[PDB]
Design an enzyme around this catalytic site. Structure first.
Site, PDB file in Angstrom:
ATOM      1  CE1 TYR A 198       1.662  -2.281   9.032  1.00 35.68           C
ATOM      2  CE2 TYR A 198       2.411  -0.788   7.309  1.00 35.68           C
ATOM      3  CZ  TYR A 198       2.115  -2.067   7.743  1.00 35.68           C
ATOM      4  OH  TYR A 198       2.272  -3.138   6.882  1.00 35.68           O
ATOM      5  CB  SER A 199       1.452   5.968  11.588  1.00 33.55           C
ATOM      6  OG  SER A 199       1.897   6.227  10.272  1.00 33.55           O
ATOM      7  CD  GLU A 200      -5.496   9.576  11.982  1.00 27.56           C
ATOM      8  OE1 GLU A 200      -5.703   9.502  13.219  1.00 27.56           O
ATOM      9  OE2 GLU A 200      -6.401   9.438  11.122  1.00 27.56           O
ATOM     10  N   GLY A 216      -2.188  12.982   7.163  1.00 27.37           N
ATOM     11  CA  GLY A 216      -2.500  11.767   6.427  1.00 27.37           C
ATOM     12  C   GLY A 216      -2.587  10.586   7.363  1.00 27.37           C
ATOM     13  NE  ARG A 217      -6.866   6.992   9.230  1.00 28.60           N
ATOM     14  CZ  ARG A 217      -8.175   7.105   9.441  1.00 28.60           C
ATOM     15  NH1 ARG A 217      -9.020   6.543   8.601  1.00 28.60           N
ATOM     16  NH2 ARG A 217      -8.636   7.781  10.487  1.00 28.60           N
ATOM     17  N   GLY A 218      -1.345   6.410   7.204  1.00 31.05           N
ATOM     18  CA  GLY A 218      -0.771   5.248   6.567  1.00 31.05           C
ATOM     19  C   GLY A 218      -1.483   3.990   7.003  1.00 31.05           C
ATOM     20  CE  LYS A 264       5.294   6.766  10.955  1.00 29.16           C
ATOM     21  NZ  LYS A 264       6.610   6.583  10.300  1.00 29.16           N
ATOM     22  CG  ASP A 294       8.422   2.184   1.660  1.00 25.89           C
ATOM     23  OD1 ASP A 294       8.169   1.770   0.514  1.00 25.89           O
ATOM     24  OD2 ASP A 294       7.571   2.810   2.366  1.00 25.89           O
TER      25      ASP A 294
HETATM   26  O1  LIG Z   1      -2.559  10.097  -4.333  1.00 25.93           O
HETATM   27  C1  LIG Z   1      -1.445   9.642  -3.973  1.00 25.93           C
HETATM   28  O2  LIG Z   1      -0.602  10.304  -3.327  1.00 25.93           O
HETATM   29  C2  LIG Z   1      -1.092   8.226  -4.327  1.00 25.93           C
HETATM   30  O3  LIG Z   1       0.325   8.129  -4.491  1.00 25.93           O
HETATM   31  C3  LIG Z   1       0.778   6.793  -4.750  1.00 25.93           C
HETATM   32  O4  LIG Z   1       0.415   5.841  -3.726  1.00 25.93           O
HETATM   33  C4  LIG Z   1       1.153   5.972  -2.508  1.00 25.93           C
HETATM   34  C5  LIG Z   1       0.108   5.913  -1.404  1.00 25.93           C
HETATM   35  O5  LIG Z   1      -0.662   7.115  -1.398  1.00 25.93           O
HETATM   36  C6  LIG Z   1       0.744   5.729  -0.040  1.00 25.93           C
HETATM   37  N1  LIG Z   1      -0.298   5.485   0.926  1.00 25.93           N
HETATM   38  S1  LIG Z   1      -0.060   5.904   2.446  1.00 25.93           S
HETATM   39  O6  LIG Z   1      -1.332   5.879   3.116  1.00 25.93           O
HETATM   40  O7  LIG Z   1       0.535   7.426   2.487  1.00 25.93           O
HETATM   41  O8  LIG Z   1       0.843   4.999   3.103  1.00 25.93           O
HETATM   42  C7  LIG Z   1       1.675   4.536  -0.037  1.00 25.93           C
HETATM   43  O9  LIG Z   1       0.904   3.350  -0.306  1.00 25.93           O
HETATM   44  C8  LIG Z   1       1.367   2.272   0.521  1.00 25.93           C
HETATM   45  C9  LIG Z   1       0.244   1.800   1.437  1.00 25.93           C
HETATM   46  O10 LIG Z   1       0.752   0.835   2.364  1.00 25.93           O
HETATM   47  C10 LIG Z   1      -0.884   1.189   0.615  1.00 25.93           C
HETATM   48  O11 LIG Z   1      -1.540   2.224  -0.115  1.00 25.93           O
HETATM   49  S2  LIG Z   1      -2.967   2.690   0.243  1.00 25.93           S
HETATM   50  O12 LIG Z   1      -3.454   3.437  -0.882  1.00 25.93           O
HETATM   51  O13 LIG Z   1      -2.916   3.628   1.585  1.00 25.93           O
HETATM   52  O14 LIG Z   1      -3.823   1.565   0.509  1.00 25.93           O
HETATM   53  C11 LIG Z   1      -0.369   0.130  -0.368  1.00 25.93           C
HETATM   54  O15 LIG Z   1       0.022  -1.025   0.402  1.00 25.93           O
HETATM   55  C12 LIG Z   1       0.036  -2.211  -0.401  1.00 25.93           C
HETATM   56  C13 LIG Z   1       1.376  -2.887  -0.151  1.00 25.93           C
HETATM   57  O16 LIG Z   1       2.403  -2.144  -0.820  1.00 25.93           O
HETATM   58  C14 LIG Z   1       1.399  -4.328  -0.652  1.00 25.93           C
HETATM   59  N2  LIG Z   1       2.633  -4.968  -0.250  1.00 25.93           N
HETATM   60  S3  LIG Z   1       3.317  -6.025  -1.234  1.00 25.93           S
HETATM   61  O17 LIG Z   1       4.688  -6.146  -0.849  1.00 25.93           O
HETATM   62  O18 LIG Z   1       3.157  -5.495  -2.763  1.00 25.93           O
HETATM   63  O19 LIG Z   1       2.656  -7.299  -1.103  1.00 25.93           O
HETATM   64  C15 LIG Z   1       0.172  -5.139  -0.209  1.00 25.93           C
HETATM   65  O20 LIG Z   1       0.134  -5.358   1.226  1.00 25.93           O
HETATM   66  C16 LIG Z   1      -0.557  -6.601   1.505  1.00 25.93           C
HETATM   67  C17 LIG Z   1       0.413  -7.669   2.009  1.00 25.93           C
HETATM   68  O21 LIG Z   1      -0.193  -8.965   1.929  1.00 25.93           O
HETATM   69  C18 LIG Z   1       0.818  -7.402   3.452  1.00 25.93           C
HETATM   70  O22 LIG Z   1       1.555  -6.189   3.496  1.00 25.93           O
HETATM   71  S4  LIG Z   1       3.056  -6.208   3.790  1.00 25.93           S
HETATM   72  O23 LIG Z   1       3.397  -5.022   4.528  1.00 25.93           O
HETATM   73  O24 LIG Z   1       3.856  -6.196   2.363  1.00 25.93           O
HETATM   74  O25 LIG Z   1       3.391  -7.378   4.558  1.00 25.93           O
HETATM   75  C19 LIG Z   1      -0.387  -7.228   4.371  1.00 25.93           C
HETATM   76  O26 LIG Z   1      -1.070  -8.474   4.556  1.00 25.93           O
HETATM   77  O27 LIG Z   1      -1.277  -6.235   3.846  1.00 25.93           O
HETATM   78  C20 LIG Z   1      -1.721  -6.463   2.501  1.00 25.93           C
HETATM   79  C21 LIG Z   1      -2.657  -5.360   2.094  1.00 25.93           C
HETATM   80  O28 LIG Z   1      -2.792  -4.378   2.856  1.00 25.93           O
HETATM   81  O29 LIG Z   1      -3.274  -5.467   1.013  1.00 25.93           O
HETATM   82  O30 LIG Z   1      -0.964  -4.405  -0.663  1.00 25.93           O
HETATM   83  C22 LIG Z   1      -1.112  -3.146  -0.005  1.00 25.93           C
HETATM   84  C23 LIG Z   1      -2.480  -2.601  -0.395  1.00 25.93           C
HETATM   85  O31 LIG Z   1      -2.358  -2.025  -1.692  1.00 25.93           O
HETATM   86  S5  LIG Z   1      -3.571  -1.858  -2.621  1.00 25.93           S
HETATM   87  O32 LIG Z   1      -4.422  -3.018  -2.523  1.00 25.93           O
HETATM   88  O33 LIG Z   1      -4.440  -0.545  -2.167  1.00 25.93           O
HETATM   89  O34 LIG Z   1      -3.070  -1.690  -3.969  1.00 25.93           O
HETATM   90  O35 LIG Z   1       0.729   0.638  -1.138  1.00 25.93           O
HETATM   91  C24 LIG Z   1       1.819   1.102  -0.344  1.00 25.93           C
HETATM   92  C25 LIG Z   1       2.936   1.525  -1.255  1.00 25.93           C
HETATM   93  O36 LIG Z   1       4.019   1.863  -0.738  1.00 25.93           O
HETATM   94  O37 LIG Z   1       2.728   1.519  -2.487  1.00 25.93           O
HETATM   95  O38 LIG Z   1       2.677   4.772  -1.030  1.00 25.93           O
HETATM   96  C26 LIG Z   1       2.143   4.808  -2.352  1.00 25.93           C
HETATM   97  C27 LIG Z   1       3.334   4.898  -3.304  1.00 25.93           C
HETATM   98  O39 LIG Z   1       4.029   6.130  -3.097  1.00 25.93           O
HETATM   99  S6  LIG Z   1       4.963   6.620  -4.241  1.00 25.93           S
HETATM  100  O40 LIG Z   1       5.630   5.453  -4.755  1.00 25.93           O
HETATM  101  O41 LIG Z   1       5.909   7.585  -3.722  1.00 25.93           O
HETATM  102  O42 LIG Z   1       3.983   7.276  -5.378  1.00 25.93           O
HETATM  103  C28 LIG Z   1       0.131   6.266  -6.028  1.00 25.93           C
HETATM  104  O43 LIG Z   1       0.683   6.914  -7.168  1.00 25.93           O
HETATM  105  S7  LIG Z   1       1.346   5.980  -8.195  1.00 25.93           S
HETATM  106  O44 LIG Z   1       2.061   4.780  -7.345  1.00 25.93           O
HETATM  107  O45 LIG Z   1       0.327   5.430  -9.058  1.00 25.93           O
HETATM  108  O46 LIG Z   1       2.348   6.675  -8.967  1.00 25.93           O
HETATM  109  C29 LIG Z   1      -1.394   6.394  -6.024  1.00 25.93           C
HETATM  110  O47 LIG Z   1      -1.961   5.395  -5.162  1.00 25.93           O
HETATM  111  C30 LIG Z   1      -1.853   7.778  -5.577  1.00 25.93           C
HETATM  112  O48 LIG Z   1      -1.721   8.725  -6.647  1.00 25.93           O
HETATM  113  O1  LIG Z   2       8.941   9.401   9.274  1.00 26.12           O
HETATM  114  C1  LIG Z   2       7.769   9.687   8.985  1.00 26.12           C
HETATM  115  O2  LIG Z   2       6.897   8.811   8.866  1.00 26.12           O
HETATM  116  C2  LIG Z   2       7.464  11.161   8.755  1.00 26.12           C
HETATM  117  C3  LIG Z   2       8.427  12.104   9.100  1.00 26.12           C
HETATM  118  C4  LIG Z   2       8.180  13.457   8.865  1.00 26.12           C
HETATM  119  C5  LIG Z   2       6.965  13.806   8.294  1.00 26.12           C
HETATM  120  N1  LIG Z   2       6.053  12.880   7.999  1.00 26.12           N
HETATM  121  C6  LIG Z   2       6.260  11.573   8.202  1.00 26.12           C
END
Ligand SMILES: O=C(O)[C@@H]1O[C@@H](O[C@H]2[C@H](O)[C@@H](NS(=O)(=O)O)[C@@H](O[C@H]3[C@H](O)[C@@H](OS(=O)(=O)O)[C@H](O[C@H]4[C@H](O)[C@@H](NS(=O)(=O)O)[C@@H](O[C@H]5[C@H](O)[C@@H](OS(=O)(=O)O)[C@H](O)O[C@H]5C(=O)O)O[C@@H]4COS(=O)(=O)O)O[C@H]3C(=O)O)O[C@@H]2COS(=O)(=O)O)[C@H](OS(=O)(=O)O)[C@@H](O)[C@@H]1O
Ligand SMILES: O=C(O)c1cccnc1
Length: 329
Positions: free
Chosen positions: A49-51, A45-47, A67, A155
């Site tokens: 901040y990372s892959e 996957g890809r976050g 990572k 988180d």
């Molecule tokens: O298929 C799935 O598996 C999905 O599962 C659930 O979603 C998870 C994501 O898949 C997962 N993504 S990751 O790539 O593995 O990391 C992760 O999402 C987090 C990511 O950072 C991002 O998601 S994205 O889809 O990859 O884009 C998203 O980030 C949000 C921030 O949370 C938000 N922060 S804030 O505090 O609310 O303000 C904000 O960030 C902005 C902010 O201004 C600044 O960020 S900062 O770090 O807070 O300082 C910065 O300037 O950046 C801004 C920005 O980037 O916009 O918004 C971003 C963007 O969000 S959005 O516009 O796409 O909506 O969300 C993160 C998160 O942790 O939520 O984790 C989620 C949740 O995992 S879980 O809780 O275990 O399920 C979802 O399923 S469900 O939540 O509906 O049940 C769904 O998306 C999907 O089903």
């Molecule tokens: O810490 C992480 O980000 C992590 C650790 C194990 C597997 N995947 C992600």
């Protein structure tokens, strides 16, 4: 004049007694391993901040996870590394095996002990009552450990729990948002995933602590025992607080705001309404009733409290009657 301060009620001073080197991550000198030891197998996957890759350690044929940290704010890389090193060996903490410089990105690549690429989000709506209790206790071991080491995860959510359900093992992962707790420090409220954000974050109260993670844990518990994903289903960060208020009530919210002398964002005036606390039985139905017990509701009630200072700590949570039926060890 303005918000009054807050302190953690446990582990308040652990970093103040440590050598500077423990918590001064900016000064940390990374010790680098050999990138040639690892071969990438497939991208997982890809976050933001990372892959993340499944990989193999060629030197022992053992699977690892790699990572590769994106450009990122560079300070955040040393923070994650130092936290992972400080916590290494703790109960249910993912183990950082190595740190190498990736030759392609030219950034640090964290090498973790292998975990089954199965996160808790894939399982947590299907567990029995006993397994909810069992895995919640395992998560609490990790949270009490990191809190006792002066660290808040910030988180906690199902995607950050990796589970090997065949072997009944769990690891808390993704420490990239974690921070060191320093009493009186103001922190960024833009942490945690929307549905898991504590009221302190949603009302912009910066002097929060370990108890943020206990709110997030409570949101996970509520989702599991009520089979409601998510429990608090806000459409944005403002509606998130409204969804909480529809359960916990607005009077306790205003009392919380009053206690910490918080100035609530005026955009809440037109959306928050007036709500009374709902009894937890409102969320019980035929599909989830086998997961709900008096002990589960009492435990949840003590996690999901507006006032961060009133929530159970991780160790107090492990003492709760909800866990008396879980076999110890
Ligand atoms: O298929 C799935 O598996 C999905 O599962 C659930 O979603 C998870 C994501 O898949 C997962 N993504 S990751 O790539 O593995 O990391 C992760 O999402 C987090 C990511 O950072 C991002 O998601 S994205 O889809 O990859 O884009 C998203 O980030 C949000 C921030 O949370 C938000 N922060 S804030 O505090 O609310 O303000 C904000 O960030 C902005 C902010 O201004 C600044 O960020 S900062 O770090 O807070 O300082 C910065 O300037 O950046 C801004 C920005 O980037 O916009 O918004 C971003 C963007 O969000 S959005 O516009 O796409 O909506 O969300 C993160 C998160 O942790 O939520 O984790 C989620 C949740 O995992 S879980 O809780 O275990 O399920 C979802 O399923 S469900 O939540 O509906 O049940 C769904 O998306 C999907 O089903
Ligand atoms: O810490 C992480 O980000 C992590 C650790 C194990 C597997 N995947 C992600």
């Amino acid at each position: 004049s303005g918000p009054v301060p807050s302190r953690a009620r446990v582990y308040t001073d652990v970093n103040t007694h440590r050598p500077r080197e423990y918590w001064d991550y900016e000064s940390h000198v990374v010790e680098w391993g050999n990138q040639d030891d690892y071969q990438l197998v497939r991208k997982l996957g890809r976050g933001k901040y990372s892959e993340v890759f499944e990989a193999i350690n060629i030197t022992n044929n053992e699977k690892v996870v790699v990572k590769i940290l994106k450009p990122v704010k560079k300070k955040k890389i040393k923070r994650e590394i130092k936290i992972l090193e400080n916590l290494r060996g703790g109960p249910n903490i993912i183990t950082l095996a190595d740190i190498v410089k990736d030759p392609v990105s030219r950034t640090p690549a964290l090498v973790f002990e292998h975990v089954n690429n199965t996160d808790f989000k894939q399982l947590y709506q299907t567990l029995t009552d006993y397994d909810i209790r069992f895995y919640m206790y395992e998560i609490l071991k990790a949270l009490d450990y990191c809190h006792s080491m002066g660290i808040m995860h910030r988180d906690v959510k199902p995607h950050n729990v990796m589970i090997d359900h065949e072997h009944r093992k769990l690891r808390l992962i993704d420490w990239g948002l974690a921070e060191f707790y320093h009493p009186g420090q103001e922190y960024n409220v833009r942490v945690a995933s929307r549905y898991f954000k504590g009221p302190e974050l949603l009302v912009d109260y910066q002097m929060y602590d370990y108890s943020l993670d206990m709110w997030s844990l409570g949101c996970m518990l509520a989702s599991m025992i009520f089979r409601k994903e998510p429990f608090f289903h806000g459409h944005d960060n403002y509606d998130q607080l409204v969804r909480i208020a529809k359960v916990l009530g607005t009077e306790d919210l205003y009392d919380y705001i009053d206690k910490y002398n918080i100035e609530l964002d005026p955009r809440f005036n037109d959306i928050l309404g007036r709500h009374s606390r709902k009894r937890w039985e409102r969320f019980v139905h035929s599909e989830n009733q086998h997961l709900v017990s008096p002990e589960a509701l009492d435990f949840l009630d003590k996690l999901l409290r507006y006032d961060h200072q009133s929530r159970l700590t991780a160790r107090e949570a492990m003492e709760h009657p909800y866990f008396y039926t879980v076999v110890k060890d």
